[PDB]
Amino acid sequence: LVPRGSHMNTSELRICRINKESGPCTGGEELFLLCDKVQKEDISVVFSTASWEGRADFSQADVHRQVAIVFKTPPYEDLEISEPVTVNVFLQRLTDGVCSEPLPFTYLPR
Amino acid sequence: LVPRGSHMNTSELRICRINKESGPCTGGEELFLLCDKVQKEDISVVFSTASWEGRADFSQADVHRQVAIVFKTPPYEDLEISEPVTVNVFLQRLTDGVCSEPLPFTYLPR
């Protein structure tokens, strides 16, 4: 349960991989990741950086057989980035607020 | 079980989506798709066109919890294509040789 920021990391939540490594900072894009056993009714996908945090948008429906999650990327804090900004994506249980190890995801401009 | 080529289609195998819509005709690229309940020990991923058929490369291991499959794309018949050639990707049970509905995937040159 060892600490990793304001929240807590676990070996219970794990993100195997995302289909798209990058994407535009506008957000809204529809992506989908693989993971281990997750509780469809208690799970979220969060994008973050030291000072910004964005949640993906998806329904319990979008969670396929507890190991995949189709979601819609949140827009990046600033939509006027001029550079490729790669942040952190990771899972997190609502209940115990526990998170998973992050995966790098990079926003791009238009 | 209605016919669709030399083989047979079913409502038992379904490909929800692939992470990458395209890729180079060289093949070898590592992709992964979503699908419904598949038998890890009886399933394959085939790329085809009316006159060419290629199989993806993956192990029973690469099949995650029966709904996702991480595989390696086969090279396209001709690696000297000058144009974007989009073929068909689909599942198929070894035993009953039954297939699924195809999904378009397009090879590209270098």
- The string of DSSP codes covering B44-98 is EEEEEETTEEEE-B--TTTEETTTEEEEEPPPPS-TT--S-EEEEEEEE-STT-E
- Per CB-CB distance under 8 Å, the chain B contacts of A32 are 17, 19, 34
Determine the 3-state secondary structure of A79 from DSSP: coil
Query: Searching chain A, which residue's CA lies closest to the CA of residue B35?
Result: A64
* Minimum distance, in Å, between the CA of residue B1 and any CA atom of chain A: 25
Chain A residue with minimum CA distance to B21: A19
For residue A65 the two structure tokens come to 């057989």
- Please name the residues in contact with A86: beta carbons below 8 A apart, sequence gap of 6 or more: A22, A104, A105, A106, A107
Report d(CA A37, CA A59) in Å as an integer. 17
* Total of domains in chain A: 1
The CA distances from residue B76 to B50, B57, B70, B97, in Å, are 13, 14, 19, 22
C-beta separation of A93 from A43 below 8 A: yes
CA–CA separation, B24 and B106 (whole Å): 8
Q: Residues B76, B89: contact at Cβ < 8 Å?
A: no
User: Encoding tokens for residue A53?
Assistant: 């945090």
Entry resolution in angstroms?
3.0
Closest among B78, B81, B88 to B110, alpha carbons compared = B81
What is the amino acid identity at position A80? E
Structure determination method: X-ray
Residues B46, B92: contact at Cβ < 8 Å? yes
How far is the C-alpha of B11 from the C-alpha of A95, rounded, in Å? Answer: 37
Sequence-distant contacts of B16-20: CB under 8 A, at least 24 apart: B16/A64, B17/A32, B17/A70, B17/B103, B18/A19, B18/B89, B18/B103, B18/B105, B19/A18, B19/A19, B19/A20, B19/A32, B20/A19
Domain of A4 in residue numbering reads as: 1-110
Question: What is the pairing mode between strands A63-64 and A68-72?
Answer: antiparallel
What separation in angstroms does the CA of A34 have from each of A37, A89, B10, B54?
A: 10, 12, 26, 25
Nearest to A76 by CA among A8, A16, A6, A29: A29
Q: What is the CATH number of the domain that holds A66?
A: 2.60.40.10
Distances (CA, A) of A33 to A3, A15, A20: 24, 7, 9
